[PDB]
Write a protein that binds this ligand. Structure first.
Ligand SMILES: [Zn+2]
Ligand SMILES: [Zn+2]
Ligand SMILES: [Zn+2]
Lengths: 408, 366, 304, 263
């Protein structure tokens, strides 16, 4: 697939020789041509594991931009603005930065709503929130909030709800004496409230339980009732002797006769009753010297060791090639085992493994090319560790293919 | 206008020299907690979440929260493996309204602690995104086998977190995924984390002092309890024997562990794939079969049958020997401990060291 | 029956009433839930107050912005800010926005500004309550006189801190107030300054009174006005609240309040469960059948 | 500063048979070597300290720790208490069959907690290094495997080196302890000359193991078997609930009340 090409680059960028070997194996049928790359393809869901939570900082994050005049060195920042304000989204599509620099647009961003929060559409990038009463019509006019009975209902709690002039109300904004100083204050309030409420809605769709939740959360008291208790399981062991004896195989232990026990207790008691330390009983030069011979650097107690010396021929060349071979073979066996160690037998995994392993039969052919160096360029060397693993990789599939009782 | 007069002798006569005797309990401690004979999540995949936000620069503790946190994290990482080599660790940092997986799923303190050392240089920036953090974690835990206790430990420094969507999405998912999440907060209690922890099955605690911080971390060292909702599995496990290059390295080529760059001539082979591994226990990166050393298994069996607290008394009123059983020595301290079963004489060090470190009472073995 | 009114001595005069009992009850707790404090002193040593007949004094507004900014980082979940007047609130917010302080506050918590529109009130409270529960944190600001202080209870996580900016004096509509004050001087011989103190204090006690509704509930409360330091005003607050308003926390600096808050939060953020409540502040049937309950509770009542 | 803790397998069964066998080497000659070795540890350094414990069938008795008679103080007092303590233990001996194994784990537990007290008692200007020397003669009692493994890890955590000397019968557990703790396990081929092995293999300091050329450690095969039919296992299945090992797949933990959730 075309999408896999971009993600697979990680493997080739990190291991170029392994990628070359992977591509070589791809061409040499040691692995599938796609698998050479597709074995590394993986992606996330967005600019991050979770959509960037630009509910905070928004454009305020960048003092205008990367600079008093705003420079043009911010992307994700302006993308957060695009996500924050759909009006800017609409205008950011209009003010195309092609063959120019956003320097001017980033400078204009400090205009009104986005930086000074004025009222009417003085924004430098459209404004549907300019009609902030019509922008709020689908929130608290024609539509409503989701808790509006359980809470946030202080608009209709008093005796003023039934009738207005019924109260002693006189504080509210009159039709006489309206002001533009107040319009600036109201704009800041409306801009901050609408911004906060709208931006929050992006992360908070929307819930039918809100009202009932707020009722139960405030009516129930965890002090007088409503406990909190655990639900683990009591671990009553069965035949604990098993752990006492431990997971060890049967020893060669054997009892004697009660007579031998009785005599043992007696003989040792009698010996300890009749015992005194003596230098002759402590040591003899014959014993010490004989023990020194056994412990000597050429004695019976000097068992086999230090046999893992440096390699018979071209360790450096072998190690250099083995690095690539270990990465490649390891990455190959990885998938083969992933397909082989499945939870259940099915043709989707069996055929994918049998093809992958059949390609690995050309990797053993590619290892035969890697075997020529050890049998030609190298004077004497054994790479049998990989060879034994490679043999096991085929053996396991042959053994599994013989399990035709629905296992194969 | 009180600090130069805050000494105990400010309004007392005997406090002119008994001040450090009147306020003598100034710096001590005495750690002990309960236990229970319940199933434990011995197979453990614990992931650490640490605030990477500017709030980590505050000096609520002796050094900035970052230094004290990383200091105790390293210690916690060590003991976590030390008390459970079977388990694995991973770390994620919540920076710039984003989350960065400082360390992947692994059991190698070498790499984990190495990452911590390097993480000391991190830049505390932006606000935390609890949602992004849990996303990366759960995305990883999704692939972990149900029987392996999938757990996350969160260290929260700030109070406000930037989530791109209501965390109830994740909590509902985590609850359904049976993943457990615990949180440790700095200086405050946050409803978000409290609801998150209590609903998810973990616990929310607040740091008071570096000792309290250790005290809380200590609790998280012990494996969590498990319910019947988790997979009661019968996991396949390998116990490969170490194999040197005995025959002059004949037919046994040296090899680097799957996974490490160290080419080892001898070590543990995989009974499943014959791969080379210099260390044990190691997960077969190319098979899924975990390889564990037989002693590492027994290393955790104390959690299955741990000791019980001994009968404490200010004097050996039972008139046992003047010499404390177990470790021989005089009852120089006017506090004695007696095992409920074997009823031998034990001292302060016996009650502490035998119960917290030996986990076996000598008289009970008799 | 509620604990919001004080001093009780003024209501029989005001209501020309004579009760059989004039009692009060002390909040009985094993772990206090409330830390009333008067942060009347700015870090710059400015006497944070509204003594200046609500005149335009940037220095106190500036100090109010500094306090709120730092306190927004210190208090967990939600904050509830009450202003003395709607005008002053609007005037104040405009200054903090112009001075940029308000943006640093947004970074700390989502601001929600009240307005006479029920749409604003309902939406603000909707978003605030859930913002206090979602990953973020919110900070409600309103007026100590408006319905918001009447209809909304700041239970548990909602409004974990209540801040009273300035003494809530309504010097507007003075004519009507004078008339009622004068009539109180006439038929009731009540001093205007005395009544004014009481009237504002009861409003402060309303915001504070709605800040807690249970034992598994608590509320930080800052009285950002030097006035509150007068023994008379402190003395006219509810006696059960005055118990926690220890002299040591009078006219605190902003830093002192922040430090005391961090301390107070640290001391109560710690686990304290239902079983831990049985030590003190909660009596089970066993304790009720124990006559101790009959003798111990006697001292909980107070009278005025 | 060092603290040697000698452990001797005071098993009357093997030593009694050894006595009944009238072999060239007996417990008498053994304790002689131990006393001389113990003396050598203290003799080697004015600041060195020593403790000795005997693992009997039913008791872990301290042999320290000296006498006050004043004929000779340092070595004679230690040897006299040792003789007296072994005589008290072995002369005043009972006879039992119900519990015939040597209390090895209890003796090791006593040693570890005793070392802990001593190392705490020591000032921090210089610190007391310590090691345990186990002289095993009887059979290896599996019933203590749980305790044995737990005490190995305690020693490991406490950073204590454990050495072991085995006479006749070997021990998988004890050889495994030497490997884990970084000590050394040795099967002495000439029990009458035991002391010479001790004065060379187990006597050298921790700071000298690295400098001396000594027999390389014998590689220990980690043979393991499940509780079900005890067969050997290289790959098995483990109960994630109780960590009981089962060689082959099954539906329920025979070791506990738990039905596997199989899919
Ligand atoms: Zn493998
Ligand atoms: Zn006991
Ligand atoms: Zn089981």
């Amino acid at each position: 697939a075309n999408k896999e090409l971009e993600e697979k680059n990680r493997m080739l960028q990190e291991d170029p020789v392994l990628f070359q070997l992977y591509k070589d194996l791809v061409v040499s049928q040691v692995i599938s041509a796609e698998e050479f790359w597709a074995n590394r393809l993986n992606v996330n869901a967005t600019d991050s594991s979770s959509t960037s939570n630009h509910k905070q900082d928004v454009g305020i994050s960048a003092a205008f931009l990367a600079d008093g005049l705003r420079y043009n060195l911010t992307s994700d920042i302006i993308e957060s603005i695009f996500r924050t304000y759909p009006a800017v989204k609409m205008k950011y599509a209009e003010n195309v930065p092609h063959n120019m620099t956003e320097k001017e647009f980033w400078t204009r961003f400090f205009q009104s709503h986005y930086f000074h929060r004025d009222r009417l559409n003085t924004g430098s990038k459209d404004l549907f929130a300019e009609c902030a009463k019509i922008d709020e019509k689908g929130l608290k006019t024609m539509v409503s909030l989701g808790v509006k009975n359980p809470l946030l209902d202080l608009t209709a709690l008093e005796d003023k709800p039934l009738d207005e002039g019924y109260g002693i109300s006189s504080v509210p904004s009159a039709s006489n004496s309206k002001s533009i100083k107040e319009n600036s204050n109201a704009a800041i309030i409306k801009r901050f409230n609408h911004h906060s409420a709208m931006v929050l809605a992006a992360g908070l769709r929307k819930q039918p339980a809100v009202k009932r939740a707020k009722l139960q959360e405030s009516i129930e008291y965890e002090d007088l009732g409503k406990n909190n208790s655990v639900k683990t399981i009591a671990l009553n062991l069965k035949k604990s002797d098993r752990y006492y004896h431990g997971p060890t195989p049967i020893q060669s232990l054997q009892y004697a006769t009660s007579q031998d026990i009785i005599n043992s207790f007696q003989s040792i008691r009698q010996e300890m009753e009749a015992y005194t330390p003596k230098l002759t009983q402590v040591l003899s030069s014959s014993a010490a010297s004989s023990t020194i011979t056994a412990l000597s650097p050429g004695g019976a107690l000097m068992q086999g060791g230090t046999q893992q010396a440096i390699n018979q021929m071209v360790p450096n060349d072998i190690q250099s090639e083995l690095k690539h071979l270990y990465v490649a073979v390891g990455e190959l066996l990885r998938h083969f085992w992933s397909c082989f160690p499945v939870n259940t037998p099915f043709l989707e995994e069996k055929v994918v493994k049998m093809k992958s392993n059949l390609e690995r039969f050309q990797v053993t052919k590619l290892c035969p090319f890697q075997e020529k160096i050890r049998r030609q360029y190298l004077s004497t060397n054994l790479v049998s560790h990989i060879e034994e693993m490679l043999q096991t990789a085929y053996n396991k599939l042959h053994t599994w293919q013989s399990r035709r009782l629905m296992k194969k | 206008e009180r600090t130069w007069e805050i000494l105990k002798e400010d309004e007392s006569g005997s406090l002119k020299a008994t001040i450090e005797d009147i306020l003598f309990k100034a710096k001590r401690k005495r750690v002990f907690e309960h236990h229970g004979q319940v199933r434990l999540g011995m197979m453990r995949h614990l992931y650490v979440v640490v605030d990477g936000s500017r709030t980590m620069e505050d000096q609520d503790l002796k050094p900035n929260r970052l230094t004290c946190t990383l200091k105790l994290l390293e210690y916690f990482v060590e003991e976590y493996f030390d008390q459970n080599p079977i388990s694995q660790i991973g770390i994620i940092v919540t920076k710039s309204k984003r989350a960065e997986k400082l360390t992947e799923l692994s059991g190698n303190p070498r790499k984990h602690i190495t990452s911590l050392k390097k993480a000391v240089d991190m830049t505390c920036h932006g606000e935390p995104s609890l949602y992004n953090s849990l996303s990366i974690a759960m995305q990883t835990l999704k692939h972990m086998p149900g029987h392996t206790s999938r757990e996350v430990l969160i260290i929260f420094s700030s109070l406000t977190t930037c989530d791109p969507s209501n965390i109830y999405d994740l909590i509902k998912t985590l609850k359904a995924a049976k993943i457990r999440v615990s949180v440790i907060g700095l200086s405050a209690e946050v409803r978000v984390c409290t609801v998150l922890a209590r609903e998810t099955g973990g616990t929310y605690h607040v740091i008071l002092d570096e000792s309290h911080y250790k005290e809380l971390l200590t609790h998280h060292v012990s494996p969590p309890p498990a319910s019947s909702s988790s997979e009661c599995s019968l996991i396949r496990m390998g116990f490969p024997q170490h194999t040197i290059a005995s025959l002059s390295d004949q037919d046994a080529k040296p090899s680097f562990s799957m996974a490490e760059p160290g080419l080892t001539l001898g070590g543990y082979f995989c009974p499943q794939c014959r791969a080379k591994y210099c260390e044990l226990p190691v997960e077969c990166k190319i098979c899924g079969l975990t390889l564990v050393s037989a002693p590492h298994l027994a290393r955790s069996y104390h959690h299955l049958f741990p000791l019980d607290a001994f009968q404490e008394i200010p004097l050996e009123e039972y008139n046992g020997e003047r010499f404390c059983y177990g470790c021989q020595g005089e009852l120089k301290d006017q506090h004695v401990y007696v095992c409920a079963v074997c009823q031998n004489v034990f001292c302060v060090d016996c009650d502490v060291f035998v119960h917290d470190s030996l986990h076996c009472c000598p008289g009970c073995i008799h | 029956t509620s604990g919001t009114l004080s001093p009780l001595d003024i209501y029989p005069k005001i209501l020309d009433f004579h009760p059989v009992t004039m009692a009060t009850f002390t909040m009985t707790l094993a772990r206090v839930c409330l830390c009333p404090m008067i942060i009347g002193r700015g870090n710059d040593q400015v006497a944070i107050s509204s003594k200046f007949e609500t005149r335009e004094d940037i220095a106190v507004i500036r100090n109010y912005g500094n306090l709120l900014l730092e306190m927004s980082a210190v208090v967990p979940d939600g904050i509830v800010a009450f202003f003395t007047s709607y005008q002053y609130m609007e005037s104040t917010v405009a200054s903090w926005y112009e001075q940029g302080i308000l943006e640093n506050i947004q970074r700390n918590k989502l601001l929600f500004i009240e307005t006479q529109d029920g749409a604003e009130t309902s939406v603000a409270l909707e978003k605030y309550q859930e913002a206090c529960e979602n990953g973020r944190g919110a900070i409600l600001l309103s007026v100590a006189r408006g319905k918001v202080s009447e209809g909304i209870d700041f239970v548990h996580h909602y409004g974990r801190a209540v801040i009273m900016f300035g003494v809530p004096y309504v010097y507007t509509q003075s004519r009507i107030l004078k008339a009622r004050l004068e009539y109180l001087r006439d038929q009731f011989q009540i001093r205007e300054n005395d009544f004014l103190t009481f009237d504002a204090m009861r409003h402060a006690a309303q915001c504070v009174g709605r800040a807690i509704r249970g034992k598994t509930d608590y509320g930080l409360m800052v009285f950002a006005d030097k006035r509150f330091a007068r023994g008379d005003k402190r003395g006219k607050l509810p006696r059960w609240i005055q118990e926690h308003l220890t002299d040591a926390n009078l006219n605190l600096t902003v830093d002192e309040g922040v430090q005391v808050a961090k301390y107070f939060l640290r001391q109560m953020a710690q686990p304290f469960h239902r079983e831990d409540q049985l030590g003190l502040s909660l009596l089970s049937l066993e304790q009720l059948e124990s006559e101790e309950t009959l003798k111990r509770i006697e001292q909980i009542a107070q009278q005025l | 500063l060092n603290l040697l803790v000698i452990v001797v397998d005071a098993n009357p069964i093997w030593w009694g048979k050894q006595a009944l066998k009238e072999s060239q080497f007996t417990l008498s000659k053994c304790i002689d070597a131990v006393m001389v070795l113990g003396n050598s540890h203290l003799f080697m350094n004015r600041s060195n300290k020593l403790a000795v414990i005997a693992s009997h069938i039913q008791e872990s008795r301290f042999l320290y720790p000296g006498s006050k008679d004043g004929k000779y103080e340092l070595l004679t007092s230690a040897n006299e208490v040792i003789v007296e303590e072994i005589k008290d233990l072995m002369t005043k001996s009972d006879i039992k069959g119900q519990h015939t194994e040597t209390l090895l784990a209890g003796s090791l537990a006593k040693a570890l907690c005793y070392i802990h007290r001593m190392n705490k008692e020591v000032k921090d200007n210089q610190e007391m290094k310590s090691r345990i020397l186990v002289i095993k003669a009887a059979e290896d009692s599996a019933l203590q495997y749980m305790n044995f493994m737990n005490v190995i890890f305690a020693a490991q955590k406490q950073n204590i080196l454990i050495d072991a000397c085995v006479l006749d019968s070997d021990s998988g557990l004890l050889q495994q302890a030497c490997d884990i703790t970084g000590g050394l396990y040795l099967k002495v081929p000439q029990m009458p000359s035991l002391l010479q092995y001790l004065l060379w293999v187990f006597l050298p300091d921790q700071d000298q193991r690295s400098q001396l050329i000594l027999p390389p450690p014998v590689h220990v095969d980690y043979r393991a078997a499940c509780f079900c039919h005890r067969n050997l296992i290289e790959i098995g299945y483990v109960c994630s609930v109780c960590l009981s090992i089962f060689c082959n797949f099954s539906p329920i933990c025979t070791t506990c009340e738990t039905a596997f959730k199989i899919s």
